[PDB]
Design a protein around this ligand. Structure first.
Ligand SMILES: CCCCCCCC/C=C/CCCCCCCC(=O)O
Ligand SMILES: CCCCCCCC/C=C/CCCCCCCC(=O)O
Ligand SMILES: CCCCCCCC/C=C/CCCCCCCC(=O)O
Ligand SMILES: CCCCCCCC/C=C\CCCCCCCC(=O)O
Ligand SMILES: CCCCCCCC/C=C\CCCCCCCC(=O)O
Ligand SMILES: CCCCCCCC/C=C\CCCCCCCC(=O)O
Ligand SMILES: CCCCCCCC/C=C\CCCCCCCC(=O)O
Ligand SMILES: CCCCCCCC/C=C\CCCCCCCC(=O)O
Ligand SMILES: CCCCCCCC/C=C\CCCCCCCC(=O)O
Ligand SMILES: CCCCCCCC/C=C\CCCCCCCC(=O)O
Ligand SMILES: CCCCCCCC/C=C\CCCCCCCC(=O)O
Ligand SMILES: CCCCCCCC/C=C\CCCCCCCC(=O)O
Ligand SMILES: CCCCCCCC/C=C\CCCCCCCC(=O)O
Ligand SMILES: CCCCCCCCCCCCCCCCCCCC
Ligand SMILES: CCCCCCCCCCCCCCCCCCCC
Ligand SMILES: CCCCCCCCCCCCCCCCCCCC
Ligand SMILES: CCCCCCCCCCCCCCCCCCCC
Ligand SMILES: CCCCCCCCCCCCCCCCCCCC
Ligand SMILES: CCCCCCCCCCCCCCCCCCCC
Ligand SMILES: CCCCCCCCCCCCCCCCCCCC
Ligand SMILES: CCCCCCCCCCCCCCCCCCCC
Ligand SMILES: CCCCCCCCCCCCCCCCCCCC
Ligand SMILES: CCCCCCCCCCCCCCCCCCCC
Ligand SMILES: CCCCCCCCCCCCCCCCCCCC
Ligand SMILES: CCCCCCCCCCCCCCCCCCCC
Ligand SMILES: CCCCCCCCCCCCCCCCCCCC
Lengths: 221, 223, 222
């Protein structure tokens, strides 16, 4: 069942990537770079999850799905780039702020991987450093990044705020599920966590980019 | 014999790097970036293959020898070669970094699938191999499609040089997955010594040979 | 004691990063990118050294202890330090990204050769070590040659600050391969405790110390 769910995920990612490629052929004032990012995220995630379906992307008394971290270390920084470029649409780019988000995010994912390989109190030291990184990412998202969005007009700002809330709501679920599942307190069962880390990413990757790109395309008129 | 062939490769890479450095001192209208790229490719490849010569860049996976150092080489050297190809098409014009990074993304994925296929057993090997081949096909479509159209927009002489280097690169690159499939990593129709010879000779033409042809053509446009 | 020293290092790195963040709030003509670089270096180094304190960032190879977390640190922290040095030379002028990325390429190779040398036995160790030393020599040639000529093209005051920072960096960097060769990874003339102390004290001056001198000088040009 776990294998079949991962095949299904990969096929959905493929369909998402094809959809974004089609959208790219009629870009409606959205730079090609934003279509490329929207395509890379699902294709990379699909390949990582395919490795799990084939029984390669995990090792074992606890089962570590290490392929998830290989996925996120590429997919999550690209999602923050998409969010940052949304705020800066039609205005000057602030690449320093964008790369600050990339740095925080990559660190966040690495701490998660190390926490998963750690035992006892050490696990929760690494987990905590990752949570602090997420908090700073959210402060940037709703603070300085949102102020850039406002400087680019009411229509863009409203779209940015919608996508920022969408992303923020989904992202807080990952460390919550992690802590409750076998990697943390073990209150939730493996099958439950597997289902969460199938459903969340579909909304986080394909769903986010549909909402993000449709909003920006609508600003063309 | 396998060790000595790898030492020989590394020394040739060093000589290639030195030649490109010399060319860089009298650049003839070619930006510094393109000389830097031409130098990094052979120096990185040389260091990787040196690790094989010293018996470090390989391990035994059951009954087969995996030359993992080749993948460490290619994951850096192949995206830089595609960058050189892309910058050739864009010589005299605006850079399209989105198209360049699309090629880099496809290429890195291609090399990774190759490494995973080599570590895989049975049908799973050929799933990963197939994803890599599809990535190569898309790279070739970009090379002879949109990238070639950019070359045309930069004039007849540049376009003619681009088309020549693109064909040279394309011809050599299709040989890699062919050799891979026929050798011990695939169907095992070819012996280890045969595969080793191919993955010594191909890279010499793919790395040093390609950059000689590429840089000489661009330098000639200056005159 | 080895664990306690690494905790202390990590706390100092955190304080360094906070100081640079504060400086960034009142930038005095120094672009945000240079404050970001100064913050990432100590934060990344702090995290790597924390892994050593917790007994995770090391393993026992042959009959020696490899502190592999040092290489994870340096492969990110050292290229960012060279970027900071390159941007100092180019302050008030056109950026030369080709020269900057040449330094990054040399540096990453240098750190990788060091890691492979540490994992190597006999003659092979000194082949990898030597390739790394040659990389450092070329970095120093760039620092005092073409990079210094760019600094001169940006005026006397900038050039004087650049020269001071370049000497500061160069003096500290030559100590690393020297300590490496003398310690358990090399000839084993120096004891583990001695090497641990050197690779605690050097990085404090190399990371936090360097950025204080570098940023204060550039701020003073305002
Ligand atoms: C912590 C893991 C590794 C993360 C490394 C990330 C490196 C961060 C540094 C990037 C420098 C950003 C340069 C921005 C240039 C343009 C500046 C601007 O105009 O705003
Ligand atoms: C498989 C792993 C992939 C990792 C790398 C992915 C890179 C994706 C990022 C895209 C950056 C696009 C740069 C856009 C520059 C705009 C200017 C121009 O087009 O010339
Ligand atoms: C040893 C690992 C190597 C990895 C790093 C690869 C570096 C090669 C890339 C070169 C990019 C060239 C910089 C772009 C030129 C912009 C113009 C300029 O200001 O000079
Ligand atoms: C491409 C995306 C990343 C996929 C990588 C993860 C799996 C690679 C490891 C393969 C090991 C197969 C042998 C085994 O462990 O049974
Ligand atoms: C729990 C989640 C914590 C953070 C939520 C956002 C924090 C405040 C937003 C930034 C404030 C601002 O700088 O304007
Ligand atoms: C949405 C909320 C989902 C709640 C799931 C709780 C059951 C999981 C478990 O304990 O196994
Ligand atoms: C720069 C070159 C990068 C490639 C080099 C890889 C070398 C890896 C060494 C691994 C340890 C070998 C152990 C042994 O000698 O038995
Ligand atoms: C694995 C990563 C693959 C991503 C490559 C996607 C190819 C996109 C081709 C069109 C590029 C564009 O939109 O300009
Ligand atoms: C799309 C094009 C893909 C081309 C790739 C071909 C791989 C064919 C599979 C290799 C032979 C299988 C032999 C076997 O099953 O034992
Ligand atoms: C910067 C943050 C990353 C630092 C790297 C440290 C890797 C730690 C991994 C160790 C896993 C447990 C080892 C063990 O105790 O067996
Ligand atoms: C493998 C690890 C590699 C890590 C490399 C980290 C990145 C290195 C250098 C990037 C710095 C470039 C700074 C450009 C600033 C331009 C500007 O501010 O005008
Ligand atoms: C250490 C050696 C420094 C040598 C400095 C050379 C300056 C002249 C140059 O090479 O351009
Ligand atoms: C300054 C010199 C510092 C080194 C002298 C002490 C060496 C101690 C040792 O070899 O264990
Ligand atoms: C039904 C399985 C679908 C696999 C699609 C290929 C993998 C995702 C894209 C890479
Ligand atoms: C598996 C990796 C490749 C997946 C491709 C998805 C669809 C993208 C098509 C792009 C075609 C570009 C031609 C110019
Ligand atoms: C253990 C083998 C893993 C191979 C894939 C590595 C991909 C790294 C991407 C970051
Ligand atoms: C292991 C770290 C990999 C990080 C992925 C790279 C993400 C950088 C994307 C930045 C795109 C900026 C676009 C500018 C226009
Ligand atoms: C792993 C280390 C990451 C360090 C990133 C620090 C982020 C600093 C905040 C960004 C600048 C905000 C400007 C207001
Ligand atoms: C680590 C140093 C703290 C950085 C926090 C920055 C948060 C962003 C502030 C915006 C006003
Ligand atoms: C992996 C090795 C990378 C080699 C980089 C070569 C740098 C040489 C730069 C020459 C000086 C330019 C002025
Ligand atoms: C995970 C391994 C990733 C390796 C990436 C290697 C670097 C490829 C991109 C560099 C080429 C960019 C050239 C830009 C030209 C601008 C002038
Ligand atoms: C056994 C593995 C075979 C690998 C073959 C790789 C593909 C060869 C080239 C065929 C497709 C060329 C596409 C050109 C399109 C131009 C537009
Ligand atoms: C032993 C057989 C050696 C075959 C060598 C083929 C190399 C092809 C290079 C083409 C130029
Ligand atoms: C026996 C140990 C010998 C050590 C060799 C180290 C030599 C110094 C570095 C290489 C410099 C190259 C000129
Ligand atoms: C004026 C030309 C450059 C002279 C460089 C002198 C050598 C500096 C060595 C510093 C490292 C200790
Ligand atoms: C057996 C002794 C070998 C000679 C050692 C030479 C002295 C130390 C060499 C390393 C110094 C690194 C800094 C180079 C710049």
């Amino acid at each position: 069942m776990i294998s079949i769910l991962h095949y299904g995920y990969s096929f959905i990612m493929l369909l998402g990537a094809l959809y974004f490629y089609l959208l790219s052929k009629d870009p409606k004032g959205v730079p090609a770079s934003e279509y490329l990012i929207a395509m890379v995220i699902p294709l990379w995630s699909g390949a990582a999850y395919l490795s799990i379906a084939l029984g390669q992307g995990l090792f074992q008394d606890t089962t570590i799905y290490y392929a998830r971290y290989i996925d996120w270390v590429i997919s999550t920084p690209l999602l923050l780039a998409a969010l940052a470029l949304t705020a800066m649409f039609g205005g000057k780019k602030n690449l320093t702020l964008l790369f600050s988000l990339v740095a925080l995010d990559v660190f966040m994912i690495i701490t998660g991987f190390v926490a998963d390989l750690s035992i006892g109190t050490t696990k929760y030291i690494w987990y905590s450093l990752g949570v602090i990184a997420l908090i700073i990412i959210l402060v940037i998202t709703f603070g300085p990044l949102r102020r850039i969005a406002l400087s680019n007009g009411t229509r863009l700002a409203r779209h940015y705020t919608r996508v920022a809330i969408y992303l923020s709501a989904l992202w807080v679920c990952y460390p919550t599920a992690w802590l409750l599942g076998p990697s943390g307190l073990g209150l939730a069962q493996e099958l439950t966590e597997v289902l969460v880390f199938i459903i969340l990413p579909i909304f986080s990757k394909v769903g986010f980019s549909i909402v993000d790109l449709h909003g920006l395309r609508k600003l063309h008129q």
